[PDB]
Amino acid sequence: PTLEWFLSHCHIHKYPSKSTLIHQGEKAETLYYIVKGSVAVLIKDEEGKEMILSYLNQGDFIGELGLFEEGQERSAWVRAKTACEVAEISYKKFRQLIQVNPDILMRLSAQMARRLQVTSEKVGNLAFLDVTGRIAQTLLNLAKQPDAMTHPDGMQIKITRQEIGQIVGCSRETVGRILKMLEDQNLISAHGKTIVVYGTR
Template identity: 65%
Template sequence: MSVKLAPNRWRIATLYTACINADTDEYYNSNYLAQSFRDTTMVALTPIPKIKNLDKLLMHCQRRRHPAKHNIICAGERSDTLYFIIKGSVTILIEDEDGREMIIAYLNTGDFFGELGLFEQAGKEQERSAWVRAKVECEVAEISYAKFRELAQQDPDILYALSGQIAQRLRDTTRKVGDLAFFDVTGRVARCLLDLCKQPDAMTHPDGMQIKVTRQEIGRIVGCSREMVGRVLKDLEERNLVHVKGKTMVVFGTR
């Protein structure tokens, strides 16, 4: 099957149908997935949105530096502070009672986090529901909910900037739920690789985009074992869709 997409459009959407009902039509979906990878001639990088009057907001924030792998927010803590990433990247994750982790999202320079309690009644905020861990060394600005509400009344554009990010995360979460429901593991891993190609730490490569990620981390993103990820990567490599060497992977045709 040949798939023709308009130039300069995101090709990631083709993966949605690539693995639907994979158990009942494995041959069709396998070939469609391969075609989807080959058609991914461009991975659009989402530019960091400019926040109006950001300097004014940062004047009221306390800045902190966090080393890589440091927990900035712990699940169960009191919600009373909003955070803004000045520099670096963080991982949002949840864990079960047995300590197994699932990665919800990566956030980067220009992103807010810790915002849920901001929209709850003052004094009745729920506890933090997720962990936020520095992916690399980070510089983060912190501001109390009370102070942010005060600034938002004076300058609503700040609140609109935050609301826009929340809306995008809701879209991403909706898509991820759809992936878990409709994709098999191969489709979820493929989607994960394409998403990682859009992260700031992805590097251009003559054959596509180069990323560094462990099989365990991919498993924590898509909800499967490290061994299953290894089998999927081997399959994708045999189809000449990726090249894998340790933690370094090149996703072909994504530059």
């Protein structure tokens, strides 16, 4: 009912898999709703290396943060992961639809709320950032060395908690906590004395 009404006001596009729906830096004037399929939100570095921030799926909106600004540009790339059917609608026109039936905005807002509910907003204090940075730096320096090992997800390195702690000036209590964090953030995997530093080469 609500969704079908909403969908009739959208342009519904098909994107085959691997195609790019949204360029970072593009003008943000539209809202998207995923009718079917999945897309990756991603960023790239100065060499084209890629980091996938998340997948969005059927029932998800894309670009909803733009609805509340005035004309900022897209902050990331969006690329079809499977063949996708994406409803698109101008922010301007969506602002009018919300008046006829706030229920679709209540859906968009629930998504933001769920998202926010699973995101840490807490950062640590400056000493914590500082020591997180030293570790990250240590990992990356290691991954650059001639005897770094190759791995399917980046370079792999051999180094212990103790060794990092001493290199960097902190406890294992502290090496462990940061490494687990980095792992939960999808930047590394660490098993035993081995760490895979993702996207190094």
